[PDB]
Amino acid sequence: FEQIDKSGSWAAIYQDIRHEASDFPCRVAKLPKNKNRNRYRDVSPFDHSRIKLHQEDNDYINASLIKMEEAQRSYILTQGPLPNTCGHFWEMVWEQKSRGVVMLNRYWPQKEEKEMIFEDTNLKLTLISEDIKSYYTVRQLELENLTTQETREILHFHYTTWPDFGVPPASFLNFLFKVRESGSLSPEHGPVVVHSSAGIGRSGTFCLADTCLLLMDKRPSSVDIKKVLLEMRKFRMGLIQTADQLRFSYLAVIEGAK
């Protein structure tokens, strides 16, 4: 609740969070078979929290499960889909019983008239409805695992304008809340899939805000934004890519309190 802020030490905190951030083994992402299932050579899932694809040949996709015990909120953070990936993306989404998708990074159907099919993973994707607001756009989507012939609906929230290492303060929250209100975050359903370009900077900022906002409800002013992020950064390396972004989560959360 206190501005650092005249001190100007915002980077010093980031350097601490970056430095004191635990690093874990990444054996499986590293494998020559999995060289091209990664978009980014530097960003990779921790071997312990990674999502495993059910398809027997290769169970690897670049996603990591965040579980936050106390807050009760679980997210799945993944790089955006590559050409290869699109099938895997929806595979996981279907495997983890997810009922919400969060794109913050400027693989779905543009027209209702035209369905989408992935031979690779044997899933279909049809648009159902669309909603454009200026800040963010929402689609109502339908997934059928063709083999099952069982259809389960999915909600896609696209934060249209978040710069690659940029923010994000009101629109962010409206958007966060919109996602909350839809019930995609609710624990009845599997994890909400959150994806930035590699699923760290924007993803972290997004998930950071929402979790801490949950803490104030549950707990009062006890919460520390660090400690939570360090803890969060245990499941997926490199969450929050800038000091400006960190400051922003701190900020959003403060504003979100009211």
């Binding site: 980014y40 960003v43 370009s197 590699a198 490199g238 890519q241």
Partner: peptide, 6 residues
């Protein structure tokens, strides 16, 4: 194969 980072 690019790096997101910096």
């Amino acid at each position: 194969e690019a790096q997101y980072q910096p």
